[PDB]
Design a protein around this ligand. Structure first.
Ligand SMILES: Cn1c(CO[C@@H]2C=CO[C@H](CO)[C@@H]2O)nc2ccc(C(=O)O)cc21
Ligand SMILES: Cn1c(CO[C@@H]2C=CO[C@H](CO)[C@@H]2O)nc2ccc(C(=O)O)cc21
Ligand SMILES: [Cl-]
Lengths: 150, 149
Protein backbone atom coordinates (compact mmCIF):
# COMPACT_ATOMS: atom_id res chain seq x y z
CA UNK A 1 0.00 0.00 0.00
CA UNK A 2 3.12 2.38 0.04
CA UNK A 3 3.17 5.66 -2.04
CA UNK A 4 6.68 7.25 -2.07
CA UNK A 5 6.44 11.05 -2.26
CA UNK A 6 10.20 11.05 -3.10
CA UNK A 7 13.61 9.39 -3.57
CA UNK A 8 17.10 10.72 -2.69
CA UNK A 9 15.89 14.16 -1.52
CA UNK A 10 18.41 16.94 -0.89
CA UNK A 11 18.59 17.69 2.87
CA UNK A 12 17.10 19.82 4.19
CA UNK A 13 13.88 18.39 2.66
CA UNK A 14 10.45 19.98 3.27
CA UNK A 15 7.42 18.44 1.56
CA UNK A 16 3.65 18.67 1.70
CA UNK A 17 1.98 15.48 2.96
CA UNK A 18 -0.58 14.75 0.24
CA UNK A 19 -3.32 13.25 2.53
CA UNK A 20 -4.26 13.45 6.23
CA UNK A 21 -2.26 11.37 8.78
CA UNK A 22 -5.40 9.40 9.78
CA UNK A 23 -5.06 6.65 12.44
CA UNK A 24 -3.44 3.64 10.67
CA UNK A 25 -1.24 5.82 8.38
CA UNK A 26 2.40 4.75 8.01
CA UNK A 27 5.37 7.00 7.20
CA UNK A 28 8.38 5.02 5.94
CA UNK A 29 11.80 6.71 5.79
CA UNK A 30 14.86 4.84 4.50
CA UNK A 31 18.33 6.36 4.91
CA UNK A 32 21.89 6.30 6.26
CA UNK A 33 23.75 8.18 9.00
CA UNK A 34 27.06 9.70 7.82
CA UNK A 35 30.17 8.88 9.90
CA UNK A 36 30.47 12.45 11.35
CA UNK A 37 26.72 12.90 12.22
CA UNK A 38 25.93 14.95 15.36
CA UNK A 39 22.12 14.76 14.97
CA UNK A 40 19.31 14.75 12.39
CA UNK A 41 15.57 15.16 12.78
CA UNK A 42 12.28 14.16 11.18
CA UNK A 43 9.67 16.89 11.92
CA UNK A 44 5.95 16.47 11.32
CA UNK A 45 4.91 20.12 10.95
CA UNK A 46 1.84 22.38 10.70
CA UNK A 47 3.01 24.09 7.47
CA UNK A 48 6.45 25.13 6.22
CA UNK A 49 6.72 28.70 7.67
CA UNK A 50 10.35 29.55 8.55
CA UNK A 51 9.47 33.05 9.96
CA UNK A 52 7.83 32.42 12.33
CA UNK A 53 8.84 28.77 12.66
CA UNK A 54 6.05 26.21 11.82
CA UNK A 55 4.69 24.21 14.81
CA UNK A 56 6.25 20.74 15.02
CA UNK A 57 3.69 18.18 16.20
CA UNK A 58 6.36 15.48 16.32
CA UNK A 59 10.14 16.15 16.39
CA UNK A 60 12.01 12.83 16.16
CA UNK A 61 15.68 13.70 16.82
CA UNK A 62 18.40 11.00 16.94
CA UNK A 63 21.58 12.32 18.62
CA UNK A 64 24.95 10.55 18.26
CA UNK A 65 27.19 12.07 21.03
CA UNK A 66 28.18 9.76 23.95
CA UNK A 67 26.13 6.49 23.99
CA UNK A 68 23.53 8.26 21.71
CA UNK A 69 19.82 8.81 22.22
CA UNK A 70 16.56 9.91 20.59
CA UNK A 71 14.96 13.19 21.73
CA UNK A 72 11.25 13.60 20.93
CA UNK A 73 9.41 16.88 21.50
CA UNK A 74 6.76 19.28 20.18
CA UNK A 75 7.27 22.93 19.12
CA UNK A 76 4.17 25.16 19.73
CA UNK A 77 4.36 28.92 19.00
CA UNK A 78 8.19 28.63 18.73
CA UNK A 79 8.56 27.03 22.24
CA UNK A 80 9.76 23.40 22.87
CA UNK A 81 7.78 21.29 25.40
CA UNK A 82 8.89 18.47 27.83
CA UNK A 83 11.60 16.40 26.12
CA UNK A 84 10.85 12.62 25.98
CA UNK A 85 14.29 10.93 25.76
CA UNK A 86 14.86 7.34 24.59
CA UNK A 87 18.37 6.07 25.57
CA UNK A 88 17.82 2.64 23.87
CA UNK A 89 18.69 3.94 20.33
CA UNK A 90 19.17 1.73 17.24
CA UNK A 91 20.87 4.49 15.18
CA UNK A 92 24.64 4.55 14.64
CA UNK A 93 27.10 6.60 12.64
CA UNK A 94 27.73 5.03 9.20
CA UNK A 95 24.71 2.66 9.44
CA UNK A 96 21.55 2.44 7.28
CA UNK A 97 18.03 2.55 8.73
CA UNK A 98 14.36 2.11 7.96
CA UNK A 99 12.05 4.24 10.15
CA UNK A 100 8.38 3.33 10.29
CA UNK A 101 6.11 5.94 11.99
CA UNK A 102 2.69 4.45 12.71
CA UNK A 103 0.07 7.13 13.38
CA UNK A 104 -2.42 5.88 15.97
CA UNK A 105 -5.48 7.63 17.47
CA UNK A 106 -3.56 8.92 20.55
CA UNK A 107 0.18 8.48 19.75
CA UNK A 108 2.91 7.81 17.22
CA UNK A 109 4.57 4.41 17.41
CA UNK A 110 8.02 4.25 15.82
CA UNK A 111 9.94 1.12 14.77
CA UNK A 112 13.47 1.14 13.28
CA UNK A 113 14.77 -1.81 11.22
CA UNK A 114 11.59 -3.76 12.27
CA UNK A 115 12.25 -3.35 16.06
CA UNK A 116 9.99 -1.18 18.29
CA UNK A 117 11.86 2.01 19.27
CA UNK A 118 9.45 4.43 21.03
CA UNK A 119 5.94 5.86 21.52
CA UNK A 120 5.01 9.57 21.52
CA UNK A 121 1.60 10.84 22.66
CA UNK A 122 -0.07 13.48 20.43
CA UNK A 123 0.32 17.00 21.87
CA UNK A 124 -1.05 18.63 18.63
CA UNK A 125 -3.96 16.86 16.90
CA UNK A 126 -2.32 14.85 14.05
CA UNK A 127 -5.03 16.19 11.67
CA UNK A 128 -3.14 19.57 11.82
CA UNK A 129 0.06 17.99 10.31
CA UNK A 130 0.47 18.73 6.62
CA UNK A 131 4.28 18.96 6.15
CA UNK A 132 7.28 16.63 6.62
CA UNK A 133 10.76 18.08 7.15
CA UNK A 134 14.07 16.24 7.43
CA UNK A 135 17.08 18.25 8.60
CA UNK A 136 20.65 17.72 9.74
CA UNK A 137 23.43 15.18 9.03
CA UNK A 138 21.53 12.33 7.29
CA UNK A 139 21.28 10.75 3.79
CA UNK A 140 17.61 9.93 2.85
CA UNK A 141 17.00 7.23 0.24
CA UNK A 142 13.14 7.42 0.30
CA UNK A 143 10.11 8.93 2.03
CA UNK A 144 6.74 7.21 1.58
CA UNK A 145 3.24 7.11 3.03
CA UNK A 146 0.74 4.30 3.31
CA UNK A 147 -2.47 6.31 3.91
CA UNK A 148 -5.45 4.86 5.83
CA UNK A 149 -7.78 6.57 3.26
CA UNK A 150 -6.15 4.58 0.34
CA UNK B 1 -4.48 -26.91 25.32
CA UNK B 2 -2.71 -24.35 27.60
CA UNK B 3 -5.29 -21.57 26.79
CA UNK B 4 -6.41 -19.13 29.54
CA UNK B 5 -9.93 -18.00 30.63
CA UNK B 6 -11.57 -20.54 28.31
CA UNK B 7 -15.40 -20.27 28.23
CA UNK B 8 -17.91 -22.37 26.25
CA UNK B 9 -21.16 -21.63 24.35
CA UNK B 10 -21.49 -17.95 25.29
CA UNK B 11 -24.86 -16.26 24.54
CA UNK B 12 -24.71 -14.07 21.37
CA UNK B 13 -24.46 -11.14 21.46
CA UNK B 14 -21.39 -11.59 23.76
CA UNK B 15 -19.59 -8.68 25.46
CA UNK B 16 -16.85 -9.82 27.83
CA UNK B 17 -13.86 -8.29 29.57
CA UNK B 18 -10.53 -9.44 28.20
CA UNK B 19 -8.75 -10.77 31.28
CA UNK B 20 -5.25 -9.34 30.53
CA UNK B 21 -3.56 -6.78 28.21
CA UNK B 22 -3.22 -7.58 24.46
CA UNK B 23 0.62 -7.49 24.55
CA UNK B 24 2.68 -8.60 21.51
CA UNK B 25 2.32 -12.36 21.09
CA UNK B 26 -1.12 -12.53 22.71
CA UNK B 27 -3.60 -14.91 21.06
CA UNK B 28 -7.40 -14.72 21.04
CA UNK B 29 -8.81 -18.11 19.95
CA UNK B 30 -12.50 -18.32 18.96
CA UNK B 31 -14.11 -21.58 17.78
CA UNK B 32 -17.58 -21.51 16.21
CA UNK B 33 -19.80 -22.16 13.19
CA UNK B 34 -21.58 -19.97 10.60
CA UNK B 35 -25.35 -20.63 10.46
CA UNK B 36 -26.74 -21.40 6.92
CA UNK B 37 -28.55 -18.00 6.53
CA UNK B 38 -25.71 -15.79 7.94
CA UNK B 39 -25.53 -12.32 6.33
CA UNK B 40 -22.55 -11.24 8.54
CA UNK B 41 -21.11 -11.51 12.06
CA UNK B 42 -18.34 -9.55 13.73
CA UNK B 43 -15.61 -9.93 16.34
CA UNK B 44 -14.90 -6.47 17.81
CA UNK B 45 -11.92 -5.68 20.06
CA UNK B 46 -13.31 -2.69 21.94
CA UNK B 47 -12.17 0.04 24.31
CA UNK B 48 -14.97 -0.59 26.87
CA UNK B 49 -18.62 -1.61 26.47
CA UNK B 50 -20.40 1.78 26.22
CA UNK B 51 -23.47 1.54 23.94
CA UNK B 52 -24.29 5.32 23.94
CA UNK B 53 -21.93 6.68 22.95
CA UNK B 54 -20.65 3.60 21.13
CA UNK B 55 -17.28 2.20 22.48
CA UNK B 56 -14.33 2.65 20.09
CA UNK B 57 -13.60 -0.54 18.15
CA UNK B 58 -9.84 -0.97 17.63
CA UNK B 59 -10.41 -4.02 15.39
CA UNK B 60 -13.71 -4.86 13.70
CA UNK B 61 -13.34 -8.27 12.02
CA UNK B 62 -16.51 -8.65 9.93
CA UNK B 63 -16.99 -11.70 7.70
CA UNK B 64 -19.81 -11.05 5.17
CA UNK B 65 -21.43 -13.90 3.19
CA UNK B 66 -23.37 -12.23 0.28
CA UNK B 67 -22.07 -12.92 -3.32
CA UNK B 68 -18.48 -14.38 -3.29
CA UNK B 69 -18.24 -13.23 0.41
CA UNK B 70 -15.46 -11.21 2.04
CA UNK B 71 -14.03 -10.01 5.34
CA UNK B 72 -14.39 -6.27 6.13
CA UNK B 73 -11.90 -4.93 8.68
CA UNK B 74 -12.30 -1.41 10.09
CA UNK B 75 -11.89 0.74 13.20
CA UNK B 76 -14.60 2.84 14.93
CA UNK B 77 -13.29 6.08 16.51
CA UNK B 78 -15.73 8.57 18.16
CA UNK B 79 -18.66 6.72 16.47
CA UNK B 80 -17.14 7.16 12.94
CA UNK B 81 -15.92 4.18 10.82
CA UNK B 82 -12.58 4.54 9.00
CA UNK B 83 -11.46 3.26 5.55
CA UNK B 84 -12.58 -0.36 5.10
CA UNK B 85 -9.82 -2.96 4.46
CA UNK B 86 -11.62 -5.70 2.52
CA UNK B 87 -10.19 -9.21 2.17
CA UNK B 88 -11.95 -10.94 -0.76
CA UNK B 89 -10.08 -14.25 -0.10
CA UNK B 90 -12.39 -15.41 2.74
CA UNK B 91 -12.12 -18.82 4.50
CA UNK B 92 -15.60 -18.50 6.06
CA UNK B 93 -18.61 -20.24 4.62
CA UNK B 94 -22.25 -20.74 5.65
CA UNK B 95 -22.64 -24.03 7.63
CA UNK B 96 -18.81 -24.42 8.09
CA UNK B 97 -17.02 -24.54 11.50
CA UNK B 98 -14.03 -22.29 12.18
CA UNK B 99 -11.17 -21.66 14.58
CA UNK B 100 -10.11 -17.98 14.53
CA UNK B 101 -6.69 -17.18 15.97
CA UNK B 102 -5.97 -13.44 16.31
CA UNK B 103 -2.30 -12.87 17.09
CA UNK B 104 -1.53 -9.40 18.42
CA UNK B 105 1.78 -8.02 17.11
CA UNK B 106 3.39 -4.67 18.04
CA UNK B 107 2.19 -3.04 14.72
CA UNK B 108 -0.75 -5.21 13.43
CA UNK B 109 -3.12 -8.10 14.02
CA UNK B 110 -2.36 -11.36 12.20
CA UNK B 111 -5.43 -13.59 11.83
CA UNK B 112 -5.42 -17.28 10.89
CA UNK B 113 -8.58 -19.39 10.33
CA UNK B 114 -8.37 -23.22 10.65
CA UNK B 115 -4.54 -22.82 10.75
CA UNK B 116 -4.32 -20.89 7.41
CA UNK B 117 -3.13 -17.25 7.27
CA UNK B 118 -6.16 -15.08 6.47
CA UNK B 119 -5.20 -11.39 6.81
CA UNK B 120 -3.17 -8.63 8.45
CA UNK B 121 -4.66 -5.44 9.93
CA UNK B 122 -2.40 -2.58 10.93
CA UNK B 123 -3.17 -0.97 14.30
CA UNK B 124 -5.17 2.32 14.22
CA UNK B 125 -5.77 2.43 18.03
CA UNK B 126 -2.98 1.31 20.43
CA UNK B 127 -3.85 -2.29 21.40
CA UNK B 128 -3.25 -1.45 25.11
CA UNK B 129 -6.64 0.44 24.88
CA UNK B 130 -8.53 -2.85 24.19
CA UNK B 131 -10.26 -4.35 27.23
CA UNK B 132 -13.51 -5.82 25.74
CA UNK B 133 -14.37 -8.64 23.28
CA UNK B 134 -17.71 -8.26 21.49
CA UNK B 135 -19.13 -10.96 19.22
CA UNK B 136 -22.32 -10.00 17.38
CA UNK B 137 -24.49 -11.12 14.47
CA UNK B 138 -25.36 -14.48 12.86
CA UNK B 139 -22.77 -16.83 14.47
CA UNK B 140 -22.58 -19.66 17.07
CA UNK B 141 -19.50 -19.53 19.32
CA UNK B 142 -18.39 -22.88 20.76
CA UNK B 143 -15.44 -21.50 22.79
CA UNK B 144 -13.25 -18.47 23.54
CA UNK B 145 -9.80 -18.55 25.13
CA UNK B 146 -6.59 -16.56 25.30
CA UNK B 147 -2.81 -16.95 25.36
CA UNK B 148 -1.22 -13.98 27.18
CA UNK B 149 2.43 -12.81 26.78
C1 LIG C 1 19.19 22.23 15.95
N1 LIG C 1 17.98 22.46 15.17
C2 LIG C 1 16.77 22.72 15.68
C3 LIG C 1 16.45 22.84 17.12
O1 LIG C 1 16.40 21.55 17.70
C4 LIG C 1 16.07 21.68 19.07
C5 LIG C 1 17.32 21.82 19.90
C6 LIG C 1 17.34 21.27 21.10
O2 LIG C 1 16.20 20.58 21.69
C7 LIG C 1 14.97 20.49 21.01
C8 LIG C 1 14.14 19.33 21.44
O3 LIG C 1 13.81 19.41 22.81
C9 LIG C 1 15.25 20.50 19.53
O4 LIG C 1 16.05 19.35 19.15
N2 LIG C 1 15.86 22.84 14.69
C10 LIG C 1 16.52 22.67 13.50
C11 LIG C 1 16.18 22.64 12.15
C12 LIG C 1 17.13 22.43 11.16
C13 LIG C 1 18.49 22.20 11.50
C14 LIG C 1 19.47 21.91 10.39
O5 LIG C 1 20.58 21.44 10.61
O6 LIG C 1 19.15 22.14 9.10
C15 LIG C 1 18.86 22.19 12.82
C16 LIG C 1 17.92 22.40 13.84
C1 LIG D 1 -24.31 -3.94 11.47
N1 LIG D 1 -23.62 -3.69 12.75
C2 LIG D 1 -22.69 -2.76 13.04
C3 LIG D 1 -22.15 -1.80 12.04
O1 LIG D 1 -21.32 -2.43 11.09
C4 LIG D 1 -20.73 -1.43 10.24
C5 LIG D 1 -21.56 -1.34 8.99
C6 LIG D 1 -21.03 -1.15 7.81
O2 LIG D 1 -19.61 -1.02 7.61
C7 LIG D 1 -18.75 -0.99 8.82
C8 LIG D 1 -17.34 -1.39 8.47
O3 LIG D 1 -16.80 -0.32 7.66
C9 LIG D 1 -19.36 -1.90 9.91
O4 LIG D 1 -19.55 -3.31 9.57
N2 LIG D 1 -22.33 -2.84 14.36
C10 LIG D 1 -23.08 -3.83 14.91
C11 LIG D 1 -23.22 -4.37 16.16
C12 LIG D 1 -24.06 -5.42 16.43
C13 LIG D 1 -24.87 -5.94 15.44
C14 LIG D 1 -25.75 -7.08 15.79
O5 LIG D 1 -26.24 -7.76 14.74
O6 LIG D 1 -25.96 -7.46 16.94
C15 LIG D 1 -24.82 -5.41 14.13
C16 LIG D 1 -23.93 -4.37 13.85
CL1 LIG E 1 -3.78 5.09 20.47
Amino acid sequence: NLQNIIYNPVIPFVGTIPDQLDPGTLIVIRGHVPSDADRFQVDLQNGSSMKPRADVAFHFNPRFKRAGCIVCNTLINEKWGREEITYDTPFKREKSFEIVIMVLKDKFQVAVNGKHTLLYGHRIGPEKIDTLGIYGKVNIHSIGFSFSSD
